[PDB]
Every structure is written in structure tokens, then in C-alpha cells.
């Protein structure tokens, strides 16, 4: 009896979905199908820099008076950008539902990009990037994306290269804004104490104006810097995509893999439009580097060859307990709702997820794992003291067993 997420797309193309909950606090967001994948290397940081500029004032609400409004009701304002999606979300009370929607309308259209601000946000972005290098796992995952999707718009980062950041102007931004902010590529998602008819009327009142070959590459990239205390290594293979159901099975396998040797093991299934990265990013000391790998590759081949029913049942329980991702909290659900409408075109209910989980057994798990892991060329990204990290022949030979 999962609460349905009623959806009401506009003629402009603005899908308006919402799910009501007891919480008297509601989270409302706008999702846009626009990321670094839609950028063409001349505007590689346009989405990030617009995400910085989007809260610095609009035409109707000039400057900090705008954020004074979102202080006045005590609401929280957040935004994020990925390689495929951009989100602007507000967590507020239920009774403040209209003005929040109106605020979101300004943020998506009628936004004002001040030239003064552009220089200030350039120094912010430039500096952050100049210090972003500090976060290793971000460096390793960016390296993995670059070496796995070389020559494609999926290699380039969300932030872009410092070059573009410095070389960006209002008009360029205006373009990205006027090009990738179309109404049919937009979802107004609401979760929590909201009524769907009131939210649909508010979307009709404001926001009714919005205008109406991906390739994986196996490659060894190695950023060696021996002064760092720890090494971060990510190994991935090509993922299926958003719409392919065996993702669910792969999620179970990821669960079964879990994390057993050197510290900081983990597993990811990053999905983009009919592509993705499925793999693991461990981080460790000089010696463990290899074994962990060796360790890690063995587990993958075990999931390709010797999966039993007990670990499959454990992975199914871990995945179901992971449906808590949906939970009931306004934010997470809203977020989930946001993607559902952008990626699948519909909100998949938790009962359908439970059905797709319970149809997974050990035989189809090792079949799908052999389809996606066995004898595949991986993408490897290492950063730190990575001399004992094995080169591409040893990893590629560890991607299969002679028995």
C-alpha cells in the first residue's frame, strides 16, 4: 500500500509529482535533465557555475533579500549537480508550501546572473577546485570516469577544468540556462505533507512559463604521488544503465560482495543513460594494494562461478533493508521521486522493487555477473603510492580464472 506519487506534467512538459506523508514538513525540488554529459567542452563548468549563481538573487528578488525569504520561514535550500541531473530542493514546513514553490520558480527561470557575482563565484569555484584536489576519492573517481569514457562527454568532470571556469561569461551561462532548462526535461517533485492538487495548482500558477554514442574504455591511468600517506584505487566495468532491470541483480551482487583484508573497501553501481560504472574503490597501504586487488578479483569471480543461495538471500535482505533509501523522510523520497521521473519516466513503487528482488536467485545472479564481470576489460584509477598496484595485464588476467 505504498503511498503513490501522483504526477501531473504540464503542457510545457513540466512533470509535477508528489507524495503525501504525515510529516508537517515538506521537501519540494526541481530536477532537470542537464549535467556535464550535455556540455560540449567549451562550457564544461556551466552547470556548476550556474549552480553557484542560482542562489545569489533573481530579477524579482534581487540579491540576498531572496535568501532572506528562505531564512524567514526557516527553510533549508540545497542544490547539487551530477553528470546527468541537476537538482534544486527546499526542505520547509507544509503551510509554507506556496511561497517555496514560487521561490523555486525564480530559481529556474527569471534567475539573474550578476556580473559582479560572476567574478566572486569564479574565485570561489576556482579556489575550491584548487583545494578539491585534496579529496582523494573524488580525484580517483574522476580519474576512473576519464579513463573509462575517454573521448566522450562522460569523461569530463562536473566542475570542469580550471580553464573553462576562468573563461566563462554571462552569455555562455545564459545559453546553458536557456538550452538545458526546458520544461519537458523538468520534474517538480514533492514529498511529505503536501496535497497533489494544491501543488498542481501552484505549478500551473508559477513555473507554467518554462520554455518548451556512450562508450566504455579499458585503460590504466595512474597518478603516482608517493608523499601521500594512503592510496585510493577504483576498478570498474561497464554498467547496464538505468532502464535495464538486471541492475537490481547487480545491486544484490554488490551487496553479497559487501566488504571483507585492507581497509576501506566499497562497491558502487553508478548508472547513466544506457551506461554506467560497476565496481569497487578500495584504499590502502603500500603492500595491501595488490592483495586486496587479488582479494577483490577473487570475490568477483566467485560471484561469477560459485554463488550459493545463502549469500544471495543475505544480499536480498541487505538490498531490501536498503530500500530504506526511500524511507519516509521528505528529502530522500523527494530526491528518489526526482530521479524516477527523469530516468525511468515513472516512479517505481517499493512493491515492484520487492518483486524484482524476490525473483532474483543464485543462478541468474551468477549468469548476470558472468555477463558483466567475467573476462571484461576494466577501468583502473589509482592515486597515491601506487607502485605496487599491478599493471593492466595482471588485473586483466585476474578478471578470469583458468579453472
Amino acid at each position: 500500500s505504498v503511498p503513490e506519487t501522483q504526477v501531473s506534467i504540464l503542457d510545457n512538459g513540466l512533470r509535477v509529482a508528489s507524495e503525501q506523508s504525515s510529516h508537517a514538513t515538506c521537501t519540494v525540488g526541481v530536477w532537470i535533465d542537464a549535467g556535464s554529459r550535455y556540455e560540449t567542452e567549451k562550457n564544461n563548468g556551466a552547470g556548476y557555475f550556474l549552480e553557484h549563481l542560482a542562489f545569489k538573487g533573481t530579477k524579482n528578488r534581487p540579491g540576498n533579500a531572496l535568501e532572506k525569504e528562505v531564512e524567514s520561514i526557516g527553510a533549508h535550500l540545497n542544490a547539487y549537480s551530477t553528470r546527468e541531473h541537476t537538482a534544486y530542493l527546499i526542505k520547509a514546513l507544509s503551510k509554507d508550501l506556496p511561497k517555496v514553490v514560487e521561490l523555486l520558480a525564480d530559481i529556474v527561470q527569471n534567475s539573474s546572473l550578476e556580473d559582479s557575482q560572476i567574478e566572486k563565484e569564479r574565485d570561489v569555484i576556482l579556489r575550491e577546485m584548487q583545494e578539491n584536489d585534496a579529496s582523494m576519492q573524488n580525484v580517483v573517481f574522476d580519474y576512473l570516469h576519464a579513463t573509462a569514457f575517454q573521448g566522450t562527454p562522460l569523461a569530463q568532470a562536473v566542475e570542469g577544468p580550471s580553464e573553462n571556469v576562468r573563461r566563462l561569461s554571462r552569455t555562455d551561462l545564459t545559453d546553458y540556462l536557456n538550452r538545458h532548462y526546458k520544461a519537458p526535461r523538468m520534474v517538480l517533485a514533492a514529498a511529505g505533507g503536501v496535497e497533489h492538487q494544491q501543488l498542481l495548482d501552484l505549478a500551473q500558477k508559477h513555473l507554467s512559463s518554462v520554455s518548451r554514442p556512450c562508450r566504455f574504455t579499458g585503460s590504466e591511468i595512474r597518478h603516482r604521488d608517493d608523499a601521500l600517506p594512503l592510496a585510493h584505487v577504483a576498478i570498474a566495468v561497464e554498467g547496464p544503465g538505468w532502464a535495464n532491470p538486471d541492475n537490481v541483480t547487480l545491486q544484490v551482487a554488490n551487496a553479497i560482495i559487501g566488504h571483507y583484508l585492507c581497509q576501506s573497501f566499497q562497491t558502487f553501481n553508478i548508472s547513466y543513460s544506457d551506461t554506467g560504472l560497476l565496481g569497487a574503490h578500495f584504499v590502502c597501504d603500500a603492500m595491501s594494494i595488490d592483495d586486496m586487488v587479488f582479494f577483490l578479483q577473487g570475490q568477483w569471480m566467485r560471484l561469477c562461478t560459485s554463488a550459493t543461495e545463502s549469500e544471495v538471500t543475505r544480499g536480498k535482505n541487505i538490498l531490501r533493508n536498503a530500500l530504506v533509501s526511500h524511507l519516509d523522510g521528505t528529502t530522500p523520497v523527494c530526491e528518489d521521486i526526482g530521479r524516477s521521473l527523469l530516468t525511468y519516466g515513472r516512479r517505481i513503487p517499493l512493491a515492484e522493487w520487492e518483486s524484482r528482488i524476490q525473483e532474483v536467485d543464485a543462478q541468474m545472479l551468477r549468469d548476470i555477473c558472468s555477463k558483466y564481470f567475467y573476462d571484461q576489460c576494466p577501468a583502473v584509477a589509482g592515486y597515491g603510492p601506487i607502485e605496487q598496484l599491478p599493471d593492466y595485464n595482471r588485473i586483466r588476467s585476474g578478471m578470469f580464472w583458468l579453472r
Partner: protein, 189 residues
């Protein structure tokens, strides 16, 4: 002794043709220098089987197909070709003992070789004068191999005497002096 040879080497690792410290660029051996050794084994087997199955007597002597006659001496006595360089040296020195000693030194001069290195560069990749001296050394080693074959008569003898003098003078004298000159050219000496 080859096992001891391999041990005394792994303690230090193999050298590279540039002669520099290759610690920044090292790779595994299983997939990179194993298939390379397998290919070299295949090529060496090709040369060995075309030596056996097609020209089985181009390197041996025909007179070894006669039985050993103590009464009959052959008109010309040789060892097999790889002893020739030494044979030449032995024949060159007039004194019997001298010949034996020089002969031994011929092989031993090599052992003496690590104490004659006077250059600040390990390899000859960046050392052209000592490269020229090295190829002259290979040249008169081939000359000594030829002379051994030739019988005792003019002018094979003189060549043998010179070739031996040039061999010992290039290994003993000319290469360290050339290495000093090469260090002087790079503003090192």
C-alpha cells in the same frame, strides 16, 4: 653455478641499455619478459633445427669421421671454432709458456674488466668513442677467429701477432683512456 649467478643478480636487479637507474620504470616479468623469452626460445630453436636438419656438418670437422689413428697425424690440427680466438693467441706468442698464459688471460682479461671501468656512465649508449673501440674489439676478435683457421705461414702469422697485441691493448689501455677523454668532453673530469 648458474643458480648462484641468478642469486648474485637478483640482489641487484638487471641492467638496462641506457645504463641508468631504472627503478622508476619496472614491470613484472610474467607477462612481459616471459612471452619475450618464449619468442626468443622459439627463434633459437628455429636456428638450431635449421642447423641440425639442413646443414649438420657446416660447423664440425670432416676428419672427426675417421677413427683415431695414433700413427697418422692430420695435416692441420684445430679445435672447434669457438676455441679459435684462443688458438690464435696461443700460436701468436713465440714462447710456449707465454702462449698458455696469454691464452688464459684471453679469457681472464674479462674478470679483470670491472677494475678497468674509469667512466662516470655505466653503459655505452651515450659513449661513442668507446663504442668505436668496442666494435674494433669485436672486429679483431673475428679476425683472431679467422686466423686460427688459417695455417702457419705468411702473412697469417703477423696478423695473429698484431691482432693479439691490439686485443690486449684495446681492453687494457685504450678503453679507460677513452672513458677519461669522454668524461673530459662532458665537463665532468
Amino acid at each position: 653455478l648458474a643458480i648462484v649467478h641468478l642469486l648474485f643478480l637478483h640482489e641487484t636487479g638487471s641492467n638496462n641499455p641506457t645504463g641508468l637507474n631504472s627503478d622508476a620504470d619496472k614491470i613484472p616479468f610474467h607477462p612481459y619478459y616471459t612471452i619475450k623469452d618464449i619468442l626468443g626460445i622459439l627463434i633459437m630453436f628455429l636456428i638450431l633445427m635449421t642447423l641440425v636438419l639442413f646443414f649438420p656438418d657446416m660447423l664440425g670437422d670432416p676428419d672427426n669421421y675417421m677413427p683415431a689413428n695414433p700413427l697418422n697425424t692430420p695435416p692441420h690440427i684445430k679445435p672447434e671454432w669457438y676455441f679459435l680466438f684462443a688458438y690464435a693467441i696461443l700460436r701468436s706468442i713465440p714462447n710456449k709458456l707465454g702462449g698458455v698464459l696469454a691464452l688464459i688471460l684471453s679469457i681472464l682479461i674479462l674478470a679483470l674488466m670491472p677494475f678497468l671501468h674509469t667512466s662516470k656512465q655505466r653503459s655505452l649508449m651515450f659513449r661513442p668513442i668507446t663504442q668505436i673501440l668496442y666494435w674494433i674489439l669485436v672486429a679483431n676478435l673475428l679476425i683472431l677467429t679467422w686466423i686460427g683457421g688459417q695455417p702457419v705461414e705468411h702473412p697469417f702469422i703477423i696478423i695473429g701477432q698484431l691482432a693479439s697485441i691490439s686485443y690486449f691493448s684495446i681492453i687494457l689501455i685504450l678503453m679507460p683512456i677513452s672513458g677519461i677523454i669522454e668524461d673530459k668532453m662532458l665537463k665532468l673530469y
